[PDB]
Design a protein around this ligand. Structure first.
Ligand SMILES: Nc1nc2c(ncn2[C@@H]2O[C@H](COP(=O)(O)OP(=O)(O)OP(=O)(O)O)[C@@H](O)[C@H]2O)c(=O)[nH]1
Ligand SMILES: [Mg+2]
Lengths: 1574, 161
């Protein structure tokens, strides 16, 4: 709460950042992340107070010997409380009191229960006993049978009734507890009595014993009373079952709610448990009670499903198992369920009662033989019978979804969420400081951490040390507690206090001692390359190395080499030494698990050996000792492990004799992925002892100058063992004994023992490269790699070498022993001499990048530099389909690969409610959304097909074209006439049309892509047929004739806006067509967009065929135009411009054109009002950009931000208030022109029936064939007969005359735009086009994206940003080449308007929009780069200079003054290039959308780079450049960035609007929220 | 203490702001939109928002009401044609509940100009005496000389403590 605390935290943050070197756990945060970090700080401080200092108090107190007794638990605890009811208030004290209270409640209850149990047992034995004239004996009890069995039964019945009534009691109570204990006593004594009556004369005395044996020794509870203590509410116990993973889709064992019933997703689970733990292991050790064995706590860690279940079921089946008392049970029991099924019970633990392996099984439903089989549905129904339906829950489910999201990674933890999820977890143990030593030290409540170079230990605290530790730490936390509440007044940490600085000096080392640093807790979704991990390594680089290790080590490709190595290695005698390694003994145990049945057979062999040992010990000469007359566990275990080791090294082919009978199981095992994995993990561990055993001297073959010739500076470590990472993995409770201990050597100890030695030159060097660091330069890898020629017994090929060395590097990364670099360096020193050796280059490349990294972030350039050189050696034999390719490095986190093994294999049906829609379409459309999306991102739809609905949401349905025939109406589909999408250019005379009968028989509906700023016009072609037009011009219904139905822009316009959106279609209803208009909109929905009906007006409007529509609209349009001229006159007057002489010129002559004299006055007036407002706003645009720059500054204490929102609001007001006016003025003028042209020359001058009378801005516009093809393949204008789709369906079967596989993609595209072939032939040629295109894009560019980065680097570049390979505008066809023409037009505006920050923002947008392929924003972006393919305003923004050779291009750029841009618009592609000269000298830019953006200081360097790139690697020929192969000729097109920025891309967005610091859904939010609201 | 400094365009608001903050005359620099400065004076950090007074952005003034403790309304004493426009805007501002607790300091600026209205004449033309339930003050100033400005700040500081 206190602002002082918040400022103090901000202060220490700022200061610790200012102190940062490279490699630090602090880094600068987003101003949002700031608060989440501080929140987690506060939370974990509260956790410390409640959960560790409290148990420390329970040992500073309790120091004095109060009365202590295991029986007087209640009294012992009570006196411990009254000893301390005097103690001052402190949250740790309150937690201590409350813990003691809860344990007092539980033990009070239990002691009561056991008390009334004992009194009940005594009462019932008195009731059943004979008179005292005889001793209690079986004879008198048998004589009693006929009465007292019936008495027992009657009492049982009465008790069951009365207790079932009492279950209405709201909480456990003396009466409830009484009755329960009595019932259990009655049940047990009844059973014991009946057993006595059944006992034979030899057994009779034993059962009489069992009756007289009151449990009065209190050696253990009655089982049912233990279950009573496990009850969560009176009459119910909480059952749980633990998942492997949460199985929302059925991939895993699960138990979930399905259709109101609870349902186990799988037929049995080993992981059931009952109850809940009373307290943490901390409290258990504080009481020094027996701790429950960890095999209860170890077996699982993912979310758990649980519910209360009726106790009778539990006590019926599972009380047979659940006894904690060591009654011998086998591995299994099978229990008859009341439905005739079995339940199988599994001894999953040989000691613990209350965790259970359970399987349900029974007569398989609907089978020929009564085989018992596991049955999830049976268990589900039986539970639903025995469960309460209330208080089902999943524990930690969002915890998983808020920390792992999914099964995340095959590698070590990266943040505390992945640590706490890992199998190593048990409980979060904070550490604290023991500062009164000469220097500060860390202690647990039980002990101070002894530390040594080899060893980590604890010394248990004596009382004086506890008093020290407590008094200090408590004083600190008391001060902190004051500071949060009493503030500086209470805590006196005034801004000048030296105590304040000492206090912070303590807090900082506390916040380091626990890894509460930002890298510990932030766990962001998309990792900015600034952030660093918990060890200060770069985060994103760690993620990339993890994905690399996983991909490499999961490939099956190298295995024939590794197992050849193993087959040789296994013959060496030294391999036996491997078995006594400490770490080796971790993993052969897993082999004991995988091969369980064979392992059993082995042990059945082995137990013979004990017999031979005892026999030999007796056969030994005159045995003076049972010399080996004993079961030696270690001997047999050795022999067994040796057999398992041998069976792991040599393949299953080594199996022989009787074990071949089980060999098919072993074969099925070893060929699993888990088999291969283990099968190699034992190999690399086995490797170290043999390598060591040669002791061959070091002899690196490649020298290195920077770091000492002839030696290596291996190891390079400082020992600084982390106590937190040790204790937060499960050591043995021997640490917890309150006794001095030496901690285990777990495998992670190799991850946590070491830290970099900053004194060594090698450390300084590595920090220059800024690699990750892990355990220093790997002397182990040297020691191995020196002797590979002896391990394999012969020299390796450089192929074999690099194969082994990459497998080795993957193994090393997997176990956490070293970084990539820490291995590859010595690899490069040891790469064998050979014709393709490459380490010499790699070294020189390291040096080259070192002299850079000292100044700049390399962003992975090092890793690409290596892979560029390694990969063509690896893939040297393979087919391009079979190459290995690693995941690809990016600014955002590592994305999946796009090639080779990693991809190989790595219409919606719809609802019959179609019939309701047919039956009452008016009510349906009034109450349901009808969308059209699938009719946008499919081009070239058939003229005629089947249309169906698909449902998507509440009243939300989507249309789709489908392939299924409508003549099976059960296809959920109907005969419909499709209409293609028409283009958006207002100059278009040739619209998309289709003809449909009046009183149709063949089909009764017509559908089209979504209308947005255009019109659908229906005209009556004859007595029997309509022609429906999709016209891209506004007000088009005025232009056509015989219009009987139409929807124009005004009919669906949102008032006061250009925006509108509606679905329109036709229906054949009550024997007539009806024009049905469903007004809609896009709507924002949680950082996404959706469509919806417009709710602010009647979302639907309907027209039957009428005659007056033309008059009714036309009069309105005439008036509205007059009105808008009034509007514009008003606005112009408001800005003082003279409107004199501005009026409509009578249309005299000519075609439609912009800037026709008739409208020239209006156009001038628009232009002027524009210039006034543009000059006006530019001053704020500039000052706003200046303020964003200001806010970029690192040092700023605090907000300056609100000035940005205030300028934003001001400008967007201006846009909303005036842009609409100017645009509408343009529209009404264009509309009036088109109407005049109609009125004078007739509609046939203003609508044209077909495009073959080609005309436009000029007779040709010399658009690249590529461009004119892409336009020709993303709009439909005219019909598309079905053969086109048949061709696409059969394009490989079909034959096409005059075509062969060796035509260029260009000559195919050209011949296709000749249109001579049939639609089926055009479909087939199209398919062949896409096939050829993606085969070439693969062969030419993706396989060589690496070397370009280095060419641009060492040409001398000064800044770069790679761009996402993945962003596509269509899922079908050639995805690669359609995006270039709009992208270059966006990029050139971005660069001209916002420089490097704009380029960054735009590439970020593309990355996100490619990571979320169907998110709302990525949809909007796809729909907003389209509409830049053929916008005539772009031809207004152009001037096509001639073709030019590159040298001339360079000289022209050198000649330019001020910003200028040029496209090359090569015959099939468009690079962009240009210069800025404004400040910082002249920076020259180059941009190829297939690679990335680069910049340069000088034209010599620029030309040398661009030549190397375009001709040196022949890409100009793949792009079809003009002229000779050498010295290629390009077009160029002098884009005017001054005008292009203002082109509309629909929905009121200018290209400028996508070119801004916000997201698109942000800007649209601001528009909606300031336009429709306000 | 957050200070909103408003008034019609060309009044001298920026000149006053920089005479007070920097002790200098600067006058050709534009203001359209806003200026803000932090000015330490005695115990108080005055943040003075000098917001442009062009009529077409006068409707935006209401987004600047947040956490404002003081109002400076600057009128060109030599501008008789626009003094009632200033009055209308002042009264419209005083209607806003966000400013209900704001104290009001008027600077009658440009006392050096030949037809400059004085503090009392501005007080009468603006109807300041009619302002009920409002702590207000008017100071005759010449921004270019700096006369009256610190008397204004001193008053404002004493009212705000
Ligand atoms: N003679 C005289 N001129 C002044 C005085 N104060 C300001 N001026 C002049 O008035 C003109 C406008 O001053 P500004 O500070 O820009 O006034 P403003 O209120 O910020 O004007 P806008 O930015 O348009 O809202 C300048 O030319 C100043 O020289 C003054 O006290 N005496
Ligand atoms: Mg000004």
């Amino acid at each position: 709460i206190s602002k002082d605390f918040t400022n103090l935290l901000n202060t220490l943050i700022d200061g610790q950042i200012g102190a940062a070197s490279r490699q630090t756990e602090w880094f600068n945060m987003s101003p949002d992340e700031r608060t989440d970090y501080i929140k987690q700080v506060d939370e974990r401080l509260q956790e410390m107070q409640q959960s560790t200092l409290s148990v420390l108090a329970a040992q500073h107190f309790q120091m004095q010997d109060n009365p202590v007794s295991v029986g007087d638990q209640l009294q012992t605890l009570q006196k411990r409380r009254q000893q301390m009811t005097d103690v001052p208030g402190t949250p740790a004290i309150n937690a201590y009191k409350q813990q003691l209270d809860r344990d007092i409640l539980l033990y009070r209850r239990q002691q009561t229960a056991m008390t009334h149990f004992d009194s009940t047992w005594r009462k019932v034995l008195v009731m059943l006993g004979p008179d005292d004239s005889k001793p209690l004996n079986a004879t008198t009890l048998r004589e009693n049978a006929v009465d007292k069995q019936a008495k027992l039964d009657t009492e049982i019945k009465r008790l069951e009734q009365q207790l079932t009534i009492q279950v209405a009691d709201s909480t456990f109570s003396q009466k409830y507890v009484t009755l329960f204990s009595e019932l259990q006593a009655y049940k047990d004594v009844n059973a014991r009595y009946n057993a006595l009556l059944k006992a034979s004369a030899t057994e009779e005395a034993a059962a009489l014993g069992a009756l007289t044996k009151v449990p009065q020794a209190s050696d253990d509870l009655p089982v049912n009373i233990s279950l009573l203590m496990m009850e969560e509410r009176p009459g119910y116990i909480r059952m749980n079952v633990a998942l492997v993973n949460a199985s929302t889709d059925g991939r895993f064992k699960d138990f979930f709610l399905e259709n109101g019933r609870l349902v186990v997703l799988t037929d049995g689970v080993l992981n059931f448990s009952f109850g809940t733990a009373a307290r943490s292991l901390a409290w258990q050790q504080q009481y020094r009670l027996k701790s429950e064995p960890p095999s209860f706590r170890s077996p699982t860690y993912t979310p758990i499903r649980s519910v209360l279940v009726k106790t009778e079921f539990v006590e019926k089946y599972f009380a047979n198992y659940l006894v904690s008392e060591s009654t011998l049970r086998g591995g299994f029991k099978a229990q008859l369920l009341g439905n005739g099924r079995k339940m199988l019970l599994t001894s999953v633990d040989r000691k613990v009662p209350n965790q259970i392996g359970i399987q349900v099984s029974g007569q398989a439903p609907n089978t020929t033989i009564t085989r018992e089989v596991p049955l999830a549905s049976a268990l589900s129904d039986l539970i639903n019978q025995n469960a309460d339906i209330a208080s089902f829950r999943t524990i930690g489910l969002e915890g998983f979804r808020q920390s792992s999201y999914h099964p995340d990674r095959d590698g070590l933890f990266v943040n505390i969420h992945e640590l706490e999820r890992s199998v190593g977890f048990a409980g979060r143990q904070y550490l604290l400081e023991m500062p009164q030593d000469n220097d500060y030290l860390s202690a647990t409540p039980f002990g101070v951490m002894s530390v040594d170079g080899d060893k980590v230990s604890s010394s248990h605290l004596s009382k004086a040390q506890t008093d020290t530790l407590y008094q200090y730490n408590a004083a600190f936390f008391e001060k902190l507690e004051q500071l949060r509440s009493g503030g500086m007044k209470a805590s006196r940490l005034f801004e000048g206090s030296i105590e304040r600085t000492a206090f912070v000096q303590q807090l900082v080392r506390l916040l380091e001692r626990n890894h509460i640093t930002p890298a510990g807790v932030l766990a962001p979704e998309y990792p900015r390359d600034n952030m660093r991990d918990i060890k200060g390594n770069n985060l994103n680089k760690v993620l990339w190395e993890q994905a690399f290790a996983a991909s490499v080590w999961r490939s099956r490709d190298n295995d024939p080499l590794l197992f050849r190595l193993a087959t040789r290695l296994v013959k060496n005698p030294a391999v036996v030494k491997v078995l006594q390694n400490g770490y080796v003994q971790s993993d052969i145990a897993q082999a004991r698990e995988l091969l369980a049945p064979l392992y059993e057979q082995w042990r059945t062999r082995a137990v013979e050996a004990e017999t031979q040992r005892v026999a030999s010990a007796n056969a030994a000469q005159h045995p003076s000792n049972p010399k080996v007359h004993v079961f030696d566990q270690a001997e047999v275990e050795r022999s067994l492990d040796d057999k398992l080791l041998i069976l792991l090294l040599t393949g299953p082919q080594s199996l022989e004799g009787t074990d071949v009978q089980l060999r098919p199981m072993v074969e099925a095992a070893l060929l699993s992925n888990e088999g291969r994995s283990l099968r190699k993990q034992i190999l690399f561990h086995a490797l170290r002892p043999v390598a060591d055993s040669f002791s061959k001297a070091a002899a690196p073959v490649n020298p290195h100058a920077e770091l000492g010739v002839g030696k290596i500076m291996i190891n390079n470590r400082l020992n600084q063992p982390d106590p937190y990472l040790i204790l937060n993995t499960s050591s043995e409770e021997q640490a917890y004994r309150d006794g001095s201990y030496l901690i285990k050597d777990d495998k992670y100890r190799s991850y946590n023992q070491f830290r970099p030695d900053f004194k060594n030159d090698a450390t300084r060097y590595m920090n220059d490269l800024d690699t990750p660091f892990v355990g220093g330069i790997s002397g182990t890898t040297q020691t191995v790699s020196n002797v590979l020629t002896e391990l394999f017994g012969g020299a390796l090929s450089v192929k074999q070498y690099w194969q082994f060395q990459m497998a080795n590097a993957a193994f090393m990364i997997r176990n956490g022993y070293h970084s990539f670099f820490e291995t590859f360096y010595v690899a490069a020193r040891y790469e064998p001499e050979g014709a393709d050796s490459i380490g010499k280059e790699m070294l020189q490349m390291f040096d080259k990048y070192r002299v850079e990294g000292s100044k700049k972030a390399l962003q992975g350039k090092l890793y690409d530099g290596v892979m560029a050189r390694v990969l063509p050696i690896i893939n040297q034999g393979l087919s391009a389909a079979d190459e290995f390719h690693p995941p690809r490095f990016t600014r955002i986190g590592p994305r999946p690969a796009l090639l080779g093994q990693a991809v190989k294999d790595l219409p919606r049906q719809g609802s019959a409610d179609i019939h309701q829609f047919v039956t009452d379409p008016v009510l349906f459309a009034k109450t349901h959304t009808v969308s059209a999306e699938a009719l946008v991102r499919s081009g070239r739809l058939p003229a005629e097909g089947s249309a169906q609905l698909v449902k998507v949401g509440s009243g939300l349905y989507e249309l789709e074209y489908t392939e299924q025939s409508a003549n099976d109406i059960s296809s959920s589909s109907i005969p419909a006439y499709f209409l293609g999408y028409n283009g958006p250019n207002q100059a278009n005379a040739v619209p998309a049309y289709v003809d449909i009968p009046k009183r149709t028989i063949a089909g009764n509906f017509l559908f089209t892509g979504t209308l947005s700023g255009g019109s659908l016009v229906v005209t009556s072609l004859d007595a029997n047929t309509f022609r429906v037009y999709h016209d891209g011009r506004v007000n088009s219904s005025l232009l056509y004739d015989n219009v009987v139905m139409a929807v124009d822009y005004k009919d669906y316009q949102i008032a006061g806006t250009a925006e509108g959106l509606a679905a329109a279609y036709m229906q054949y209803v009550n024997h007539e067509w009806q024009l049905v208009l469903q007004r809609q909109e896009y709507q924002r929905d949680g950082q996404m967009l959706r469509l919806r009906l417009r709710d602010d007006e009647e979302p639907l409007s309907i027209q039957v065929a009428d005659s007056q529509v033309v008059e009714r609209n036309q009069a309105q349009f005439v008036a509205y135009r007059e009105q808008i001229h009034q509007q514009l006159k008003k606005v112009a007057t408001q800005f003082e411009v003279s409107i004199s002489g501005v009026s409509d010129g009578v249309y005299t002559e000519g075609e439609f054109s912009p800037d026709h004299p008739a409208i020239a006055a209006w156009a001038k007036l628009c232009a002027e009002v524009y210039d006034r407002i543009n000059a006006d706003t530019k001053q704020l645009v500039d000052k706003r950009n200046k303020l964003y720059e200001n806010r970029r500054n690192t040092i700023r204490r605090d907000l300056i931000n609100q000035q940005i929102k205030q300028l934003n609001i001001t400008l967007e007001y201006y846009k909303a208030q005036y842009d609409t006016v100017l645009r509408e003025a343009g529209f009404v003028e264009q509309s009036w022109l088109w109407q005049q042209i109609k009125a004078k020359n007739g509609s046939a001058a203003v609508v044209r029936i077909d495009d073959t009378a080609i005309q436009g801005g000029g007779k040709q516009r010399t658009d690249s064939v590529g461009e004119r093809y892409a336009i020709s393949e993303a709009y439909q204008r005219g019909a598309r007969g079905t053969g086109f789709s048949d061709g696409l369906r059969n394009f490989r079967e079909i034959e096409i005359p005059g075509v062969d596989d060796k035509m260029s993609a260009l000559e195919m595209k050209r011949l296709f735009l000749e249109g001579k072939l049939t639609s089926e032939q055009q479909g087939a040629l199209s398919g062949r086009i896409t096939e050829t295109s993606r085969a070439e894009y693969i062969d030419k560019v993706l396989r060589q994206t690496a070397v370009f980065s280095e060419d641009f680097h060492d040409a001398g570049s000064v800044f770069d940003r790679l761009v996402p390979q993945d962003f596509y505008l269509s899922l079908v066809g050639d995805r690669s080449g359609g995006r270039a023409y709009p992208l270059v037009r966006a990029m050139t505006v971005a660069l001209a308007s916002g420089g490097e920050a704009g380029i960054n923002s735009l590439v970020q947008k593309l990355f996100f929009a490619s990571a979320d392929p169907q998110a709302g924003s990525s949809t909007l972006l796809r729909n907003s780069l389209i509409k830049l393919h053929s916008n005539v305003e772009a031809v207004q923004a152009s001037t096509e200079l001639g073709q030019f050779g590159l040298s001339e291009v360079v000289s022209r750029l050198a000649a330019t003054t001020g910003t200028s841009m040029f496209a090359l618009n090569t015959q099939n592609h468009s690079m962009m290039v240009g210069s800025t000269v404004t400040t910082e000298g002249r920076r020259y830019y180059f941009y190829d959308p297939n690679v990335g953006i680069f910049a340069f200081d000088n034209t010599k360097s620029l030309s040398r780079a661009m030549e190397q790139h375009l001709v040196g690697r022949r890409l100009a020929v793949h792009y079809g450049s003009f002229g000779s192969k050498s010295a290629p000729a390009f077009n160029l097109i002098e884009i005017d960035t001054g005008k292009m920025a203002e082109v509309p891309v629909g929905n009121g967005l200018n290209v400028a609007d996508l070119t801004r610091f916000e997201e698109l859904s942000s800007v649209i939010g601001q528009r909606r929220q300031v336009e429709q609201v306000m | 203490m957050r200070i909103l400094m408003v008034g019609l365009d060309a009044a001298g608001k920026t000149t006053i702001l920089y005479k007070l903050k920097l002790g200098e005359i600067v006058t050709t620099i534009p203001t359209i939109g806003f200026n803000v400065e932090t000015v330490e004076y005695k115990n108080i950090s005055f943040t003075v928002w000098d917001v442009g007074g062009l009529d077409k952005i006068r409707p935006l003034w209401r987004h600047y009401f947040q956490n404002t403790q003081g109002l400076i309304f600057v009128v060109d004493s030599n501008d008789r044609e626009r003094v009632n426009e200033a009055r209308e805007e002042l009264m419209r501002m005083l209607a806003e509940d966000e400013l209900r607790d704001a104290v009001l300091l008027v600077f009658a600026n440009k006392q050096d100009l030949p037809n400059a209205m004085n503090a009392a004449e501005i007080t009468d033309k603006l109807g300041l005496h009619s302002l009920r339930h409002r702590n207000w003050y008017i100071q005759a100033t010449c921004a270019t000389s700096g006369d009256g400005l610190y008397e204004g700040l001193d008053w404002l500081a004493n009212q705000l403590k």
